[PDB]
């Protein structure tokens, strides 16, 4: 997702009091609204409970190296929460896929949709379920009756763009409390007046 020619606040996206986890590096969480960037990229996907640990700048594994590589200069925020009551069902929910095998490393912020059968040896298989080859794509094991470490969690990534360009998005002055019956200075669109 790309957000351009819009303006919004991140305070609503934090006071939900329902997110199980929250990770944002590069910028302090309480001082990101007033700082202004150009574009915001939203990368939304699903992942298990034992793989949210590997989604961090500078970690290895089987998902953070084969599906989405996090660079060292990663300044985005990761917001994840549990919604197992909608994306899982009895009898086996196998609608979600993930990659297990890859030939080599992949560049960060790059998507791979190759369905070619990964070759482990030197003998071709001609795309069959034979010997010395296996399919890289494997189905998940989601179940609504799981514990706390294997449920489908929704993981999103909100990165920022920093280039020689204007800010499509910005943090405008918030709605300050409308204090009353006190000598307070205000500026309501035409004048900087002080009074009750």
């Amino acid at each position: 997702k790309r957000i351009s020619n819009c303006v919004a606040d991140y305070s609503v996206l934090y006071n939900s009091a329902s997110f199980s986890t929250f990770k944002c590096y590069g910028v302090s969480p309480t001082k990101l609204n007033d700082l202004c960037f150009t574009n915001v990229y939203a990368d939304s996907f699903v992942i298990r409970g034992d793989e949210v640990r590997q989604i961090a700048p500078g970690q290895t594994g089987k998902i953070a190296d084969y599906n989405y590589k996090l660079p060292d200069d990663f300044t985005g925020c990761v917001i994840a929460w549990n919604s197992n009551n909608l994306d899982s069902k009895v009898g086996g929910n196998y609608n979600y896929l993930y990659r297990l095998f890859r030939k080599s490393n992949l560049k960060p912020f790059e998507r791979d949709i190759s369905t070619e059968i990964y070759q482990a040896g030197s003998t071709p298989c001609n795309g069959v379920e034979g010997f010395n080859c296996y399919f890289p794509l494997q189905s998940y094991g989601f179940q609504p009756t799981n514990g706390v470490g294997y449920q489908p969690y929704r993981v999103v990534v909100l990165s920022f763009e920093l280039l020689h360009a204007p800010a499509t998005v910005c943090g405008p002055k918030k709605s300050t409390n409308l204090v009353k019956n006190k000598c307070v200075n205000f500026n309501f669109n035409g004048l900087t007046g002080t009074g009750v």
Epitope: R2, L97, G127
Partner: antibody
């Protein structure tokens, strides 16, 4: 390879239509198989794609749970079953194929296409 | 739907004919690639160019594909005796959670 569909077929408004996609040769058990429909008078829309090696159904949000796709790997033939035919289903389906690659874009492309099943329903 | 294409364009047999495809910032503006297909009235459409960087086998080099940021363009050189078909834009849409085709441009004037 060479993928061959059936010919014209006329059903009833409220019946079930069953068509099949036939693959000659190989390279059918290693790539995802989708269906593309072209309608005279509007654009083309994509119902969903089925991966045949593992058997996961991946449809689109614009289509509800009415049409189901089943694939058999014993004879390399995929079957399409659609029910509750309406008046705006007079179009032609196609048997497409997905060939993934690596890059920044990573967009699904249909390099291989079928012939076309002329499915028209009316009174 | 989310993709809009001109109804028809005019050209001459010997000059450059170009097309413009404008969509949204979530399907083509995000960074996905385009795939251009030719819809001949009477035969199955085939693949012309994928990713706007590689040339598939059996496709002439006269077709050129470029992505000028949000909008994607296709340019041809010379009008032969087989351009009486339709051109479509195909790109992955995140909002639609799938592939969506464009409107379609008819390439004919008289005769």
């Amino acid at each position: 390879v060479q993928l061959v569909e059936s010919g014209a077929e006329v059903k009833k408004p409220g019946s079930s239509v069953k068509v099949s996609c036939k693959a000659s040769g190989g390279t059918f058990s290693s790539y995802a198989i989708s269906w593309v429909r072209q309608a005279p008078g509007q654009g083309l829309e994509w119902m969903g794609g089925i991966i045949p090696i593992l058997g996961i159904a991946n449809y689109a949000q614009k289509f509800q749970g009415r049409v189901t796709i089943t694939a058999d790997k014993s004879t390399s033939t995929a079957y399409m079953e659609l029910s509750s035919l309406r008046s705006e289903d007079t179009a032609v389906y196609y048997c497409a194929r997905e060939n993934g690659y690596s890059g920044y874009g990573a967009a699904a492309n249909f390099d291989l296409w079928g012939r076309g099943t002329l499915v028209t329903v009316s009174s | 739907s989310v993709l809009t294409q001109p109804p028809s364009v005019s050209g001459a047999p010997g000059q450059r004919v170009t097309i413009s495809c404008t969509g949204s910032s979530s399907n083509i503006g995000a960074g996905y690639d385009v795939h251009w297909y030719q819809q001949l009235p009477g035969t199955a459409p085939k693949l012309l160019i994928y990713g706007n960087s590689n040339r598939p086998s059996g496709v002439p080099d006269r077709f050129s594909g470029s992505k000028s940021g949000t909008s994607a363009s296709l340019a041809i050189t010379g009008l032969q005796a087989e351009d009486e078909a339709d051109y479509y834009c195909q790109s992955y849409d995140s909002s639609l959670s799938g592939s969506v085709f464009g409107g379609g441009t008819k390439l004919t004037v008289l005769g």
